[PDB]
Copies of this chain bind each other. A is one copy, B any other.
Amino acid sequence: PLDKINSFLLANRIVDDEKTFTSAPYIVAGNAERIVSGTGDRIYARGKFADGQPAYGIFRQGKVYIDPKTKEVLGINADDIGGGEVVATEGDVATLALTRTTQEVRLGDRLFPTEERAVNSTFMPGEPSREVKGEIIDVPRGVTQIGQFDVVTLNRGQRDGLAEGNVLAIYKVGETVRDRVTGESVKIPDERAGLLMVFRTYKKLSYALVLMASRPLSVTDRVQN
């Protein structure tokens, strides 16, 4: 059980509040050691973040567009470095060392403050509430039908239900066409083996490491129970 949690923990880079630092990005640059990633290497960056918080989380911006009438994207902040620490340089720039977590940090990337969140392996048994039902979108993978497990972003109405219920089963809705009668195609949900483990960041969507029991489901599919 702990190892499954460890895999998710390896996948736990996506955080909320893309809008905040879209409004105030901490700008990284530097050719003294011209890298787009490093472990303990020196990058420089401009912003008060140099003056303030020594650590920080490097996040690339994804967008999760739900509530089409409200047409809101609550984005995805993919955490690039595992961690980093700073030295202060004049000019409001900083020189930081980088503990890297598999994600290259674009030399011209956006930096955000460090926000440590505690995750436990106590989620492993599951918290299954069926009422929660919603679609899935915006996987970092971007690939439809991803299987075995993956970090998925459940939708917003689905997100509030998620606030109620953590665990749900997989459904892939497939359209069946009445080719020889009408040509009309009716989408039919197909319950798929495999369930999601969901960790919810309120005020954002739910970051869920879903374990797929064989069934490969499209980027958009019905998570329900």
Cα distance A44–B178 when bound, in Å? 10
- Min distance, Cβ A107 to any Cβ of chain B, angstroms: 8
* Given A32-B176, A44-B176, A178-B46: A188 in contact with B27 (beta carbons within 8 A): no
Partner of A30, one of B27, B29, B176, B181: B176
Cα distance A42–B215 when bound, in Å? 14
CB-based contact A91/B186 at 8 Å: yes
Residues of B within 8 A of A27 (CB): 178, 180-181
Cα distance A218–B66 when bound, in Å? 53
Q: Is A133 an interface residue (CB 8 A)?
A: no
CB-based contact A46/B188 at 8 Å: no
Residues of B within 8 A of A181 (CB): 25, 27, 46
Q: Is A172 an interface residue (CB 8 A)?
A: yes
| Complex copy number for this chain | 2
* Given A95-B188, A174-B32: A108 in contact with B179 (beta carbons within 8 A): yes
* Given A176-B44, A180-B108, A181-B46: A93 in contact with B29 (beta carbons within 8 A): no
Binary flags per residue of A75-112, CB closer than 8 Å to B gives 1, else 0: 00000000000000101010100000000000110000
Q: Is A31 an interface residue (CB 8 A)?
A: yes
Q: Is A190 an interface residue (CB 8 A)?
A: yes
**Chain A contact residues, CB within 8 Å of chain B:** 25, 27, 29-32, 42, 44, 46, 89, 91, 93, 95, 107-108, 172, 174-181, 186, 188, 190
Using A29-B177, A93-B176 as known contacts, list a sample of 15 further A-B pairs with CB atoms less than 8 Å apart, ordered by residue number in A: A25-B181, A27-B181, A29-B179, A31-B174, A31-B175, A32-B172, A32-B188, A32-B190, A42-B190, A46-B181, A89-B188, A91-B188, A93-B188, A107-B179, A108-B180
